[PDB]
C-alpha cells in the first residue's frame, strides 16, 4: 500500500504502449469470476449445512399426522391468544398433550386428529391477565417439532413437481 509509483506502473500507463496494445485486458484478468465462483460455492455449502426449523385449554387442531408423530408428549409448543397482539399479550406456553386417535372433525381434512395442548399455568403472567379465556376460542398454538436443512426448501417444490406424471 505505502509504495511510491514505481517504473512498471509508469510503463503501464505509457501512451506509446497503449497505442501498440489493441484489444486490451484488465489488470486482474480473472479475479471477478473467481470471486463469483467462491461466493456460489460458499452459498451452496452453507445451504447444506444450515438447519432451519378456559383453564384446561386445548389447541387440538388440523395438522399433518406425521408432524404429530414426530412430536412427543410435553413438546415445546407455544400458544398465542387472539384477545390481544402477540407482542403486547405475549407468547404463552401450551404443553402439547398426546393427540387423540380419533379426529375432532373431518370438515377441514382427514389429518385433523386434534393434537390437544394445555397451558402450563406459569406462562400467562400478570401482564396478560386474560383469565376470561372464553374457552370457545381457537388461540393459535404454534407447535414446532423439527428442523430441515434450508436446502430442503429447494427439495420440496421442484422434486414434488417432477414426481407427478
Amino acid at each position: 500500500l505505502d509504495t511510491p509509483v514505481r517504473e512498471k506502473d509508469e510503463n503501464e500507463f505509457l501512451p506509446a504502449h497503449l497505442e501498440l496494445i489493441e484489444t486490451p485486458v484488465s489488470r486482474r484478468p480473472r479475479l471477478v469470476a473467481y470471486f463469483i465462483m467462491g461466493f456460489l460455492v460458499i452459498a451452496v455449502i452453507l445451504s447444506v449445512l444450515g438447519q432451519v426449523e378456559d383453564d384446561t385449554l386445548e389447541v387440538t387442531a388440523l395438522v399433518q399426522n406425521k408432524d404429530i408423530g414426530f412430536i412427543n408428549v410435553g413438546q415445546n409448543a407455544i400458544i398465542k391468544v387472539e384477545a390481544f397482539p402477540y407482542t403486547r399479550y405475549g407468547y404463552l406456553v401450551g404443553k402439547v398433550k398426546n393427540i387423540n386417535l380419533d379426529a375432532i372433525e373431518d370438515q377441514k381434512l382427514g389429518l385433523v386428529f386434534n393434537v390437544i395442548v394445555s397451558v402450563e399455568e406459569n406462562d400467562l403472567s400478570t401482564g396478560n391477565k386474560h383469565i376470561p379465556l372464553s374457552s370457545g376460542m381457537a388461540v393459535t398454538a404454534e407447535i414446532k417439532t423439527g428442523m430441515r436443512s434450508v436446502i430442503s426448501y429447494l427439495l420440496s417444490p421442484l422434486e414434488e413437481s417432477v414426481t407427478e406424471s
Binding site: 438447519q51 432451519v52 426449523e53 407455544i78 402477540y86 407468547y91 404454534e142 414446532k144 428442523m147
Partner: peptide
C-alpha cells in the same frame, strides 16, 4: 419474531 425461531 413470530415463531420464536432461533437456529434460523
Amino acid at each position: 419474531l413470530v415463531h420464536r425461531g432461533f437456529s434460523t
